[PDB]
Design an enzyme around this catalytic site. Sequence first.
Site, PDB file in Angstrom:
ATOM      1  N   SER A   1      69.390 -36.833 -51.784  1.00 11.79           N
ATOM      2  CA  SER A   1      68.785 -35.628 -52.315  1.00 11.79           C
ATOM      3  C   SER A   1      67.386 -36.047 -52.719  1.00 11.79           C
ATOM      4  O   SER A   1      67.139 -37.217 -53.021  1.00 11.79           O
ATOM      5  CB  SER A   1      69.566 -35.083 -53.508  1.00 11.79           C
ATOM      6  OG  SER A   1      69.774 -36.084 -54.486  1.00 11.79           O
TER       7      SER A   1
ATOM      8  N   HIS B   1      69.782 -33.940 -47.851  1.00  9.92           N
ATOM      9  CA  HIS B   1      70.393 -32.891 -48.655  1.00  9.92           C
ATOM     10  C   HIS B   1      69.273 -32.227 -49.429  1.00  9.92           C
ATOM     11  O   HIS B   1      68.639 -32.847 -50.285  1.00  9.92           O
ATOM     12  CB  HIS B   1      71.412 -33.521 -49.604  1.00  9.92           C
ATOM     13  CG  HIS B   1      72.072 -32.553 -50.539  1.00  9.92           C
ATOM     14  ND1 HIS B   1      73.230 -31.877 -50.215  1.00  9.92           N
ATOM     15  CD2 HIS B   1      71.763 -32.190 -51.807  1.00  9.92           C
ATOM     16  CE1 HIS B   1      73.602 -31.129 -51.243  1.00  9.92           C
ATOM     17  NE2 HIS B   1      72.727 -31.297 -52.218  1.00  9.92           N
TER      18      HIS B   1
ATOM     19  N   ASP C   1      67.881 -29.384 -51.892  1.00  7.08           N
ATOM     20  CA  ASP C   1      68.327 -28.522 -52.974  1.00  7.08           C
ATOM     21  C   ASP C   1      67.399 -27.338 -53.179  1.00  7.08           C
ATOM     22  O   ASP C   1      66.259 -27.496 -53.611  1.00  7.08           O
ATOM     23  CB  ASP C   1      68.411 -29.316 -54.278  1.00  7.08           C
ATOM     24  CG  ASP C   1      69.535 -30.296 -54.266  1.00  7.08           C
ATOM     25  OD1 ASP C   1      70.680 -29.838 -54.119  1.00  7.08           O
ATOM     26  OD2 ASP C   1      69.272 -31.510 -54.392  1.00  7.08           O
TER      27      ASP C   1
ATOM     28  N   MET D   1      66.760 -23.962 -55.185  1.00  8.37           N
ATOM     29  CA  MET D   1      67.116 -23.304 -56.440  1.00  8.37           C
ATOM     30  C   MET D   1      66.187 -22.118 -56.682  1.00  8.37           C
ATOM     31  O   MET D   1      64.973 -22.271 -56.587  1.00  8.37           O
ATOM     32  CB  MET D   1      67.008 -24.291 -57.608  1.00  8.37           C
ATOM     33  CG  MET D   1      67.901 -25.508 -57.434  1.00  8.37           C
ATOM     34  SD  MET D   1      67.752 -26.547 -58.908  1.00  8.37           S
ATOM     35  CE  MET D   1      68.674 -27.996 -58.412  1.00  8.37           C
TER      36      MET D   1
ATOM     37  N   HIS E   1      71.481 -27.048 -49.689  1.00  9.09           N
ATOM     38  CA  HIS E   1      72.309 -26.712 -50.841  1.00  9.09           C
ATOM     39  C   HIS E   1      71.686 -25.485 -51.499  1.00  9.09           C
ATOM     40  O   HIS E   1      70.684 -25.574 -52.221  1.00  9.09           O
ATOM     41  CB  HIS E   1      72.395 -27.889 -51.816  1.00  9.09           C
ATOM     42  CG  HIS E   1      73.361 -27.670 -52.933  1.00  9.09           C
ATOM     43  ND1 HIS E   1      73.557 -28.584 -53.941  1.00  9.09           N
ATOM     44  CD2 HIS E   1      74.183 -26.623 -53.202  1.00  9.09           C
ATOM     45  CE1 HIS E   1      74.456 -28.113 -54.791  1.00  9.09           C
ATOM     46  NE2 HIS E   1      74.849 -26.928 -54.365  1.00  9.09           N
TER      47      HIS E   1
ATOM     48  N   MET F   1      71.478 -23.052 -53.997  1.00  9.22           N
ATOM     49  CA  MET F   1      71.808 -22.666 -55.362  1.00  9.22           C
ATOM     50  C   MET F   1      70.988 -21.437 -55.679  1.00  9.22           C
ATOM     51  O   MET F   1      70.039 -21.477 -56.461  1.00  9.22           O
ATOM     52  CB  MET F   1      71.521 -23.808 -56.330  1.00  9.22           C
ATOM     53  CG  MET F   1      72.523 -24.949 -56.162  1.00  9.22           C
ATOM     54  SD  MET F   1      71.916 -26.450 -56.933  1.00  9.22           S
ATOM     55  CE  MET F   1      70.815 -27.007 -55.627  1.00  9.22           C
TER      56      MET F   1
ATOM     57  N   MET G   1      80.843 -30.094 -56.599  1.00 12.78           N
ATOM     58  CA  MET G   1      79.829 -30.508 -57.567  1.00 12.78           C
ATOM     59  C   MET G   1      80.440 -31.420 -58.615  1.00 12.78           C
ATOM     60  O   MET G   1      81.504 -31.108 -59.157  1.00 12.78           O
ATOM     61  CB  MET G   1      79.239 -29.288 -58.282  1.00 12.78           C
ATOM     62  CG  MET G   1      78.457 -28.361 -57.395  1.00 12.78           C
ATOM     63  SD  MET G   1      77.087 -29.222 -56.620  1.00 12.78           S
ATOM     64  CE  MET G   1      76.183 -29.830 -58.043  1.00 12.78           C
TER      65      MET G   1
ATOM     66  N   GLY H   1      71.466 -27.675 -61.752  1.00 11.87           N
ATOM     67  CA  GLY H   1      70.276 -27.062 -62.318  1.00 11.87           C
ATOM     68  C   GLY H   1      69.885 -27.529 -63.706  1.00 11.87           C
ATOM     69  O   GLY H   1      68.908 -27.034 -64.276  1.00 11.87           O
ATOM     70  N   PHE H   2      70.632 -28.481 -64.254  1.00 10.88           N
ATOM     71  CA  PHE H   2      70.366 -28.974 -65.604  1.00 10.88           C
ATOM     72  C   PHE H   2      69.879 -30.424 -65.626  1.00 10.88           C
ATOM     73  O   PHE H   2      69.962 -31.100 -66.651  1.00 10.88           O
ATOM     74  CB  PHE H   2      71.596 -28.806 -66.501  1.00 10.88           C
ATOM     75  CG  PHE H   2      71.913 -27.377 -66.826  1.00 10.88           C
ATOM     76  CD1 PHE H   2      71.423 -26.790 -67.983  1.00 10.88           C
ATOM     77  CD2 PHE H   2      72.680 -26.612 -65.968  1.00 10.88           C
ATOM     78  CE1 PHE H   2      71.703 -25.473 -68.278  1.00 10.88           C
ATOM     79  CE2 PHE H   2      72.962 -25.292 -66.259  1.00 10.88           C
ATOM     80  CZ  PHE H   2      72.472 -24.723 -67.420  1.00 10.88           C
ATOM     81  N   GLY H   3      69.369 -30.895 -64.496  1.00  6.17           N
ATOM     82  CA  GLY H   3      68.763 -32.212 -64.431  1.00  6.17           C
ATOM     83  C   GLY H   3      69.757 -33.354 -64.521  1.00  6.17           C
ATOM     84  O   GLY H   3      70.894 -33.249 -64.054  1.00  6.17           O
ATOM     85  N   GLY H   4      69.321 -34.453 -65.124  1.00  5.40           N
ATOM     86  CA  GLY H   4      70.126 -35.658 -65.202  1.00  5.40           C
ATOM     87  C   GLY H   4      71.345 -35.488 -66.082  1.00  5.40           C
ATOM     88  O   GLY H   4      71.233 -35.378 -67.304  1.00  5.40           O
TER      89      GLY H   4
ATOM     90  N   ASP I   1      78.323 -34.222 -55.016  1.00  4.34           N
ATOM     91  CA  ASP I   1      76.921 -34.097 -55.370  1.00  4.34           C
ATOM     92  C   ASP I   1      76.821 -33.951 -56.864  1.00  4.34           C
ATOM     93  O   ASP I   1      77.343 -32.995 -57.420  1.00  4.34           O
ATOM     94  CB  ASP I   1      76.377 -32.840 -54.706  1.00  4.34           C
ATOM     95  CG  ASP I   1      74.922 -32.589 -55.001  1.00  4.34           C
ATOM     96  OD1 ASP I   1      74.215 -33.478 -55.538  1.00  4.34           O
ATOM     97  OD2 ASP I   1      74.491 -31.467 -54.661  1.00  4.34           O
ATOM     98  N   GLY I   2      76.128 -34.884 -57.506  1.00  4.72           N
ATOM     99  CA  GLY I   2      75.896 -34.816 -58.941  1.00  4.72           C
ATOM    100  C   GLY I   2      76.175 -36.139 -59.625  1.00  4.72           C
ATOM    101  O   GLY I   2      77.328 -36.489 -59.850  1.00  4.72           O
ATOM    102  N   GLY I   3      75.125 -36.886 -59.952  1.00  3.50           N
ATOM    103  CA  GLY I   3      75.303 -38.156 -60.632  1.00  3.50           C
ATOM    104  C   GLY I   3      76.021 -39.185 -59.784  1.00  3.50           C
ATOM    105  O   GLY I   3      76.624 -40.121 -60.315  1.00  3.50           O
TER     106      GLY I   3
ATOM    107  N   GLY J   1      70.602 -39.320 -55.336  1.00  3.36           N
ATOM    108  CA  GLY J   1      69.188 -39.093 -55.513  1.00  3.36           C
ATOM    109  C   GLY J   1      68.445 -40.337 -55.960  1.00  3.36           C
ATOM    110  O   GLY J   1      68.098 -41.189 -55.146  1.00  3.36           O
ATOM    111  N   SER J   2      68.216 -40.450 -57.265  1.00  7.72           N
ATOM    112  CA  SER J   2      67.372 -41.510 -57.809  1.00  7.72           C
ATOM    113  C   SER J   2      67.809 -42.914 -57.404  1.00  7.72           C
ATOM    114  O   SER J   2      66.975 -43.778 -57.146  1.00  7.72           O
ATOM    115  CB  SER J   2      67.298 -41.404 -59.334  1.00  7.72           C
ATOM    116  OG  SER J   2      68.592 -41.381 -59.901  1.00  7.72           O
TER     117      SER J   2
HETATM  118 FE   LIG Z   1      72.606 -30.576 -54.306  1.00  6.10          FE
END
Ligand SMILES: [Fe+2]
Lengths: 221, 222
Positions: free
Chosen positions: B7, B32, B34, B36, B67, B69, B138, B143-146, B172-174, B194-195
């Site tokens: 991502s 991927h 994103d 939003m 993705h 959103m 998910m 949508g709420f960042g880290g 997807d997510g963390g 991602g990071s």
């Molecule tokens: Fe995503």
Amino acid sequence: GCKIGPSILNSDLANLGAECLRMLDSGADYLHLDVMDGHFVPNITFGHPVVESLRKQLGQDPFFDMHMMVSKPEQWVKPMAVAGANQYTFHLEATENPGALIKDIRENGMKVGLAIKPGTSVEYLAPWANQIDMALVMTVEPGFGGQKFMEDMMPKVHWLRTQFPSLDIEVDGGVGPDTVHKCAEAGANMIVSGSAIMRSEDPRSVINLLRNVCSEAAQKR
Amino acid sequence: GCKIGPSILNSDLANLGAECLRMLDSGADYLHLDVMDGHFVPNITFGHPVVESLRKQLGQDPFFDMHMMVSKPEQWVKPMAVAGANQYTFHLEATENPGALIKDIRENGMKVGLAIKPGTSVEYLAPWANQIDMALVMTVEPGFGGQKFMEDMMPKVHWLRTQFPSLDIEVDGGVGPDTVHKCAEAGANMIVSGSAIMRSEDPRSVINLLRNVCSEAAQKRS
Ligand SMILES: [Fe+2]
Ligand SMILES: [Fe+2]
């Protein structure tokens, strides 16, 4: 006091930094960044995360005019300020309480722009003119076109210029070498231009032309 | 059949072309992306105009998992198809007519992804699982960042893998090297990170690690 601000929706958005840098090198006075949320207008462009990256690449000097075509302008004030936006131009149509929003924008350290769509009477904008830094008279319907410059928006610009001689007035929508004369003669001093500049092989020449037409008209006023 | 899809929201979004080229050169299996709209989730990233320029820069080969959103996924199907997206992954929460939307996505030549947020029962996916190309579970609230990876989502993944052994399942997510094994042991075969990939000096090594943890866990269960 005339300034040219290229819009970049017509640019290579995968290489946005390069496109902005060459606009600045070409003598752009500021960059006009169109933020659309898919709700207030039928397109989604980009939001504060892109602005933040752009600010990081371009450094502190360039002026970002954020054209906030979003349904909840209150929501993005702080994010845009943190991202490094200079001016937050919100739509009068998008809020029930423009005064409160104007206050919030200033409290977050940004200049205040106030935009009206073609179908919105300039009479709605006038009551707020002494609270803002810049009025934006749209000359196409935002989020659709891909449209021809609307010459019947010029009376709005002329009225504002007449009533508020010191107000900065921006036009945005199909403005180019062919229509800038209309805007300048009507009273606009801030010109947003997209394709005409971005698609040019000589953007410095286009920018100079646009600014010269505006300057000439201003000197006549 | 395990694939890694970076991502790119923590990337330099002023140089999305270069960042994506770097990912592909590092062996990313897909990208991927994103999207939003500031309504379905409290953030605005980018939309089809950016996708269209990215497709032009990257050429026809790379796979884009969109993705979506967004509050009205019906609205962006044609724009994304025209932009050159391969797969349109919409949220089940965002439409009252998933069947019609799935049909519209396929009619526009795209693959179909179906995503569920943490609070949404995985059971809601079942009626549609035979009509989609990929399920996205998910593992943070979008949508709420880290946010912290939600291990309590793993039973969703395991349930899907058990019910639909041939279904591609994305998490997807963390997700990163710290949590990829949890996802893989539960049954996920498509990993968004991602990071952990984007920040690395050697993204190829991170991508290879994620993929091999995934593949070896998948081989083990077999
Ligand atoms: Fe995503
Ligand atoms: Fe604009």
